[PDB]
């Protein structure tokens, strides 16, 4: 986030998700999984809207719907059941929060509230 801000000031351009994604994966790969960061990286930039996941060993993947963590299987069950192409904003919030709820109820590692 710090290096992306300096890059944005240097280039006089709004930062890109692929930049944050590339910088994260090269850092995590360097530390061979010893930095246990499992991230879902999303954002809008001049290129458009992007959704990525990045695992601790520095592997990235692209999707329309992703889930990570202990409740990923509970969440992915809901996403695999209710996801379609061309979702509206209201539908995507509903699907996202429902997938978290699946994790909250059915996973002991997940609980409390839903942040969006």
């Amino acid at each position: 986030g710090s290096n992306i801000e300096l890059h944005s000031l240097y280039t006089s351009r709004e930062p890109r998700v692929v930049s944050a994604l590339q910088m994260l994966k090269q850092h995590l790969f360097k530390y061979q999984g010893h930095i246990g960061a499992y991230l879902i990286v999303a954002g809008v930039d001049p290129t458009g809207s992007h959704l990525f996941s990045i695992h601790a060993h520095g592997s990235t993947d692209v999707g329309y719907y992703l889930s990570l963590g202990s409740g990923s299987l509970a969440a992915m069950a809901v996403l695999e059941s209710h996801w379609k192409q061309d979702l509206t904003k209201e539908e995507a919030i509903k699907l996202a929060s429902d997938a978290i709820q699946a994790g909250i109820w059915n996973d002991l590692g997940s609980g409390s509230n839903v942040d969006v």
Partner: peptide, 5 residues
Amino acid sequence: XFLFX
């Protein structure tokens, strides 16, 4: 310990 979703 550490804090660990």
